[PDB]
Amino acid sequence: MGKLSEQLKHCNGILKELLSKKHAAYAWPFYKPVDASALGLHDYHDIIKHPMDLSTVKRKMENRDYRDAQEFAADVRLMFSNCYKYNPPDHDVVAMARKLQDVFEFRYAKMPD
Numbered sequence: 001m002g003k004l005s006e007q008l009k010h011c012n013g014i015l016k017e018l019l020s021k022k023h024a025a026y027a028w029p030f031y032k033p034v035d036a037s038a039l040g041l042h043d044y045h046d047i048i049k050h051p052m053d054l055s056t057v058k059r060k061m062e063n064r065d066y067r068d069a070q071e072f073a074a075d076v077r078l079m080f081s082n083c084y085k086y087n088p089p090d091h092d093v094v095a096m097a098r099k100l101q102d103v104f105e106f107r108y109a110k111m112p113d
């Protein structure tokens, strides 16, 4: 019942909410890795050096990869940053990223001390 364990339980709660039916209308583009070939995005891996998605975050949490809340938050924010770097700001996927990041940042802020 340490501080790191407690903060990682809060992180796991956030991850479960991001994957829940409540947010599915805007969360679904972030469920699995970007399939660049399938979407015709043949420049994606030249522009994005570190791809990230919620299935990879879930795998790392299940494997006890994350040692603290800051490491978890860095991967979730990397996922949003990749979206803002690659996509024009008027694409629907950017509006969806903005909405899911608002859910993330407001609950992350309620981290137990």
Ligand SMILES: CNC(=O)c1cc(C(=O)N[C@H]2[C@@H]3COC[C@@H]32)cc([C@@H](C)c2ccccc2)n1
Residues within 6 Å of the ligand: 029, 030, 034, 039, 041, 083, 086, 087, 088, 091, 092, 093, 096
């Ligand atoms: C994480 N996902 C993405 O970054 C992404 C990018 C693009 C995409 O085509 N981006 C190309 C824009 C014009 O040329 C350069 C950027 C399409 C989609 C798909 C799944 C999609 C998402 C939401 C609503 C409809 C469709 N996701």
